[PDB]
Scaffold this active site. Structure first.
Site, PDB file in Angstrom:
ATOM      1  N   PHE A 210       0.863  -1.180   0.000  1.00 51.48           N
ATOM      2  CA  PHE A 210       0.000   0.000   0.000  1.00 51.48           C
ATOM      3  C   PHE A 210       0.898   1.227   0.000  1.00 51.48           C
ATOM      4  O   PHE A 210       1.868   1.298   0.764  1.00 51.48           O
ATOM      5  CB  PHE A 210      -0.975  -0.006   1.190  1.00 51.48           C
ATOM      6  N   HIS A 213       0.722   7.606   1.992  1.00 46.43           N
ATOM      7  CA  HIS A 213      -0.525   8.326   2.198  1.00 46.43           C
ATOM      8  C   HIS A 213      -0.453   8.994   3.560  1.00 46.43           C
ATOM      9  O   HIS A 213       0.394   8.656   4.404  1.00 46.43           O
ATOM     10  CB  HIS A 213      -1.751   7.372   2.163  1.00 46.43           C
ATOM     11  N   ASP A 215      -3.356   9.689   6.694  1.00 45.70           N
ATOM     12  CA  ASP A 215      -4.613   9.072   7.091  1.00 45.70           C
ATOM     13  C   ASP A 215      -5.799   9.999   7.020  1.00 45.70           C
ATOM     14  O   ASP A 215      -5.706  11.200   7.318  1.00 45.70           O
ATOM     15  CB  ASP A 215      -4.512   8.526   8.503  1.00 45.70           C
ATOM     16  N   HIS A 269       3.094   7.662   5.495  1.00 39.65           N
ATOM     17  CA  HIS A 269       3.544   6.308   5.792  1.00 39.65           C
ATOM     18  C   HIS A 269       3.046   5.379   4.702  1.00 39.65           C
ATOM     19  O   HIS A 269       2.182   5.731   3.881  1.00 39.65           O
ATOM     20  CB  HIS A 269       3.098   5.865   7.193  1.00 39.65           C
TER      21      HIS A 269
HETATM   22  C1  LIG Z   1      -1.836   0.787   7.580  1.00 43.12           C
HETATM   23  C2  LIG Z   1      -3.124   0.094   8.011  1.00 43.12           C
HETATM   24  C3  LIG Z   1      -4.009   1.045   8.811  1.00 43.12           C
HETATM   25  C4  LIG Z   1      -3.884  -0.477   6.793  1.00 43.12           C
HETATM   26  N1  LIG Z   1      -4.279   0.561   5.852  1.00 43.12           N
HETATM   27  C5  LIG Z   1      -5.497   1.107   5.832  1.00 43.12           C
HETATM   28  O1  LIG Z   1      -6.402   0.734   6.574  1.00 43.12           O
HETATM   29  C6  LIG Z   1      -5.701   2.258   4.842  1.00 43.12           C
HETATM   30  C7  LIG Z   1      -4.632   3.320   5.013  1.00 43.12           C
HETATM   31  S1  LIG Z   1      -4.710   4.107   6.638  1.00 43.12           S
HETATM   32  N2  LIG Z   1      -6.994   2.872   5.072  1.00 43.12           N
HETATM   33  C8  LIG Z   1      -7.981   2.907   4.192  1.00 43.12           C
HETATM   34  O2  LIG Z   1      -7.902   2.365   3.104  1.00 43.12           O
HETATM   35  C9  LIG Z   1      -9.213   3.644   4.621  1.00 43.12           C
HETATM   36  C10 LIG Z   1     -10.344   2.674   4.981  1.00 43.12           C
HETATM   37  C11 LIG Z   1     -11.580   3.399   5.513  1.00 43.12           C
HETATM   38  C12 LIG Z   1     -12.784   2.471   5.792  1.00 43.12           C
HETATM   39  N3  LIG Z   1     -13.137   1.698   4.635  1.00 43.12           N
HETATM   40  C13 LIG Z   1     -13.954   3.298   6.314  1.00 43.12           C
HETATM   41  O3  LIG Z   1     -15.012   3.305   5.578  1.00 43.12           O
HETATM   42  O4  LIG Z   1     -13.835   3.927   7.364  1.00 43.12           O
HETATM   43  C14 LIG Z   1      -3.097  -1.547   6.051  1.00 43.12           C
HETATM   44  O5  LIG Z   1      -2.612  -2.460   6.828  1.00 43.12           O
HETATM   45  O6  LIG Z   1      -2.955  -1.531   4.830  1.00 43.12           O
HETATM   46 FE   LIG Z   2      -2.514   4.922   7.169  1.00 42.72          FE
END
Ligand SMILES: CC(C)[C@@H](NC(=O)[C@H](CS)NC(=O)CCC[C@H](N)C(=O)O)C(=O)O
Ligand SMILES: [Fe+3]
EC number: 1.21.3.1
Length: 330
Positions: A210, A213, A215, A269
């Site tokens: 990933f 980005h 948050d 991150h």
């Molecule tokens: C880094 C972790 C937090 C995780 N990444 C993630 O969760 C990534 C980046 S923070 N976050 C997202 O895609 C947002 C999801 C929001 C969710 N669908 C909602 O409707 O609220 C990973 O392990 O990839």
């Molecule tokens: Fe994140």
């Protein structure tokens, strides 16, 4: 070949549950320091049973079936489910996309909730697998929401004190009846062979699951397995965040950066590619849809900011779409 370890201090947050105001200030100072440095810390002594969380999540992931995944799928994977933008199952695509996950929202978003009745964006009624097939899962998951909500409330008291505010400055907008906070139960699989199409490559050559980005959150409250994967960008380059499956990894999101005029930045991150079966369990601390905090700047004598107030719901709906556009539908 020698990526440095990021400074990620372990902060005992237990005073934030109590009434010792001086002890709380000393925790707040530690939060301030971490937020001004790499932007990450581990919350320890947080009171949550994370081993049981891991166990119950594992039982879910290793017994959900392909049939159930379609039946729970978000709209991006199943056009019949137009109401499921956020909550539900996010499918893998063997050969192309390795990660899969299950997202749920506030358990108080029931059919009779006024925001559900109004069809306000970002509010949805959670979907759940059949109880007989996943005994105890929904109850465990709903209780986990409230356990991590409680931890997050305490952390928000720390952030408020750290910023020179009264302890309920953020927490007063973080309420059980309307919080937009979400839990995501992410599975990263082990795969042999691992599909190259599911591996991204950073500019510095690092293989990623990933991309970089900031948050979409006020703060992010994250439990992961003990497999190192996260990296934070610093002035000295990307640095590895050491795993700690006994603590919660905490960082600010871009709403905190906005309301502090970038005094507490939202750290950039990314997630390294690792060929290992692991869990990643974030709680995104989101406020209510109409919550607005007036921006301020703790570096200026009068605290005045050059930023305009932004309602949380507007921030969230648009931020989630933008993150999908930038880094892909998960
Ligand atoms: C880094 C972790 C937090 C995780 N990444 C993630 O969760 C990534 C980046 S923070 N976050 C997202 O895609 C947002 C999801 C929001 C969710 N669908 C909602 O409707 O609220 C990973 O392990 O990839
Ligand atoms: Fe994140």
């Amino acid at each position: 070949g020698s990526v440095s370890k990021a400074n990620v201090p372990k902060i005992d947050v237990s005073p934030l549950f109590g009434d010792d105001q001086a002890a709380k200030m000393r925790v707040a100072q530690q939060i301030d320091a971490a937020s001004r440095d790499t932007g990450f810390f581990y919350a320890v002594n947080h009171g949550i049973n994370v081993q049981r969380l891991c166990q119950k999540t594992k039982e879910f992931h290793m017994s959900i079936t392909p049939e159930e995944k379609w039946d729970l799928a978000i709209r991006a994977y199943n056009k019949e489910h137009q109401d499921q933008v956020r909550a539900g199952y996010y499918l893998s695509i063997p050969g192309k996309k390795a990660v899969e996950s299950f997202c749920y929202l506030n358990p108080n978003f029931t059919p009779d909730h006024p925001r559900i009745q109004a069809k306000t964006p970002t509010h949805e009624v959670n979907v759940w697998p059949d109880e007989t097939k996943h005994p105890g899962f929904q109850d465990f998951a709903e209780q986990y929401y409230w356990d991590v909500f409680g931890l997050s409330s305490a952390l928000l008291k720390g952030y408020a004190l750290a910023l020179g505010k009264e302890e309920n400055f953020f927490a007063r907008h973080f309420k059980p009846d309307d919080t937009l906070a979400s839990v995501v139960l992410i599975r990263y699989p082990y795969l042999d062979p691992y599909p190259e199409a599911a591996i991204k490559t950073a500019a510095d050559g690092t293989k990623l699951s990933f991309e970089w980005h900031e948050d979409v959150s006020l703060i992010t409250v994250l439990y992961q397995s003990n497999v190192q994967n996260l990296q934070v960008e610093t002035a000295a380059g990307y640095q590895d965040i050491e795993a700690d499956d006994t603590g919660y990894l905490i960082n600010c999101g871009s709403y905190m950066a906005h309301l502090t005029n970038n005094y507490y930045k939202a750290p950039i991150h990314r997630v390294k590619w690792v060929n290992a079966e692991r869990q990643s369990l974030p709680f995104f601390v989101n406020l209510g849809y109409d919550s607005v905090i007036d921006p301020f700047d703790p570096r200026e004598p009068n605290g005045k900011s050059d930023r305009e107030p932004l309602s949380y719901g507007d921030y969230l709906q648009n931020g989630l779409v933008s993150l999908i556009n930038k880094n892909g539908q998960t």
